[PDB]
Amino acid sequence: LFVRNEVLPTLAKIENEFTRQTFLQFLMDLYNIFLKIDDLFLENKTYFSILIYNGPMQLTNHLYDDIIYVSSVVENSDDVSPSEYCMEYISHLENLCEENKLSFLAHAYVFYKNFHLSKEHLLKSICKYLNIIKKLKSSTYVADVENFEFCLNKMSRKWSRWEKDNFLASLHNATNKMMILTK
């Protein structure tokens, strides 16, 4: 199956060598990137049926609820909105998807993947640092990534070698643009 034999090794190979106001913005940025992914799936309902019919993932809803919670323990909470950088990235995903649906899909995947892989350490240590009592809904593991990986395996069964090549190459680009959203 494509994920275990091709995607996960490729990601392994791709391994080489801040106030509360700011944290709320961080979550708003993440909410909007993930929301955009959900919108670009629905805007191509036919192409992405296996990820839709698989049924919605829970992460956007978790972040939504987590933004409401964190809003409650931030002064001037209604002032904060998505950052300049996030709105670039949202347009970039539109554009990516417009050009090549699998180029876009690689970027969605890596985003779900790298968030899963880093969320628990990040959100615990940020919420410690900023004295934010309640653990966030979006730090919980609810198989979003596993479900993503399940759908990749099924989609890859109807992909040309070329389409797989594009997807695996696109992981590099997505991995990099990931890091850049870490400040």
Author numbering: 95 to 111, 133 to 298
Q: Can I see the authors' text?
A:
Nevertheless, malaria parasites express a divergent HO-like protein (PfHO, Pf3D7_1011900) with unusual biochemical features. Although this protein shows distant homology to HO enzymes, it lacks the strictly conserved active-site His ligand and does not degrade heme in vitro or in live cells. Heme oxygenases are ubiquitous enzymes that retain a conserved α-helical structure and canonically function in regioselective cleavage of the porphyrin macrocycle of heme to release iron. We have elucidated an essential role for PfHO within the apicoplast organelle of P. falciparum, where it associates with the apicoplast genome and nucleic acid metabolism enzymes and is required for organelle gene expression and apicoplast biogenesis.
As an initial step towards understanding this divergent function, we determined a 2.8 Å-resolution X-ray crystal structure of the HO-like domain of PfHO (residues 84–305) in its unliganded state, as we were unable to crystalize PfHO84-305 in the presence of bound heme. The structure obtained for apo-PfHO84-305 was highly α-helical with an overall fold expected for an HO homolog, including strong concordance in the positions of α-helix-forming sequences between PfHO, HuHO1, and SynHO1. Although the purified protein contained residues 84–305, electron density to support structural modeling began with residue 95 at the start of an α-helix, suggesting that residues 84–94 are disordered. A structural homology search using the DALI Protein Structure Comparison Server revealed strong structural similarity between PfHO and structures of HO enzymes from plants, mammals, and cyanobacteria. Superposition of crystal structures for PfHO and SynHO1 revealed very similar α-helical folds, with a root-mean-square deviation (RMSD) in the positions of backbone atoms of 2.11 Å for the two structures. Despite overall structural similarity between PfHO and SynHO1, we noted several points of structural divergence beyond loss of the conserved His ligand. In our PfHO structure, the distal helix adopted a similar architecture to that observed in the SynHO1 structure but featured bulkier, charged Lys-Glu residues in place of the conserved Gly-Gly sequence in active HOs. In contrast to the ordered distal helix, we were unable to resolve the structure of the C-terminal region of the proximal helix (residues 112–133) of PfHO due to weak electron density for these residues, possibly reflecting static or dynamic structural disorder in this region. We identified changes in the calculated electrostatic surface potential of PfHO84-305 between the proximal and distal helices that diminish the electropositive potential in this region compared to HuHO1 and SynHO1. Based on these observations, we conclude that PfHO is a divergent HO homolog that retains the overall HO fold but has lost key active-site and surface features that suggest a unique function independent of heme degradation.
